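Researcher: Let's continue the batch. This sequence belongs to Peptidase M28, and it's 293 residues. Same format as the previous ones, please.
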Amino acid sequence: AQKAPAQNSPARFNGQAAYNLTRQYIAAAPKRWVGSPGHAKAEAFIKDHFKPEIAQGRFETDRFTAGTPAGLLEMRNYIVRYPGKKDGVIVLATHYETNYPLRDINFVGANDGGSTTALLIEMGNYLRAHPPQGYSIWLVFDDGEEAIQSWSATDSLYGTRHLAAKWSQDGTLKKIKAFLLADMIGDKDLNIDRDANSTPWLLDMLKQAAKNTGHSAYVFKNSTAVEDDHLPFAKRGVPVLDIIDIDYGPRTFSMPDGYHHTAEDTLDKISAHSLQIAGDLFLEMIRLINQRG
Ligand code: NA
Ligand SMILES: [Zn+2]
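Model: Same format as before. Here are the structure tokens for Peptidase M28:
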């Protein structure tokens, strides 16, 4: 006996739409540090792109007061739910704000936050049109990922430390099959680093997803270990994967970290081709996680 084979293939992710959304997000809210009017415009942009989910009761605002070196700061995570047909949740996440210490330069985070906020908005468009047939998919737009003063275990990851604690306390973490973080994947010169902090079965699955989507040339050139929004989940036993390109721009004596955290992180540094690859990988990861069961 056997299942009847499916006669239709899934719709493809729209990378050009994700690129256009990045341009629109940067136009609407170029500087987005916590507390600023630009941050509020960024939040309005996200909400304006999830009106159906808001009307359906599938959009959550998770507001909290963070203790930071700059004092008490209000932060807001946003969670958009696409319920599936079986119990269990795949979370896709991105940060959406820009660095507070960079508030007085023209830092707009086009790749760093912008491209992945757009990626997940486009994922919402995709999932609204093509509802998930396996696990639920939840989209997380997290606040306060970047250090308020200087990166450390206490000054970073405010939104995900809060969200991981909230979901631990209420039992939600038990349901998470995988937490998939998108970070800095609009880079015109794209290669996803192999993050040793990510869960091995998810790293192996991303290598398989790249094979399946014809994108092996873009995955795992460099091996490293990344401190990012997946750590508060990983430290509580949640399977995590950081789909990140941390090698952003040419490293030189004067720019030892390339375009990362400089005013050169602009829209001319990202491409629809890279966002297409990223979205293809995310959709294939969802299929493979569903298959793993
Ligand atoms: Na790169
Ligand atoms: Zn950053």
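Researcher: Any comment?
Model: The longest strand covers residues 71-82.
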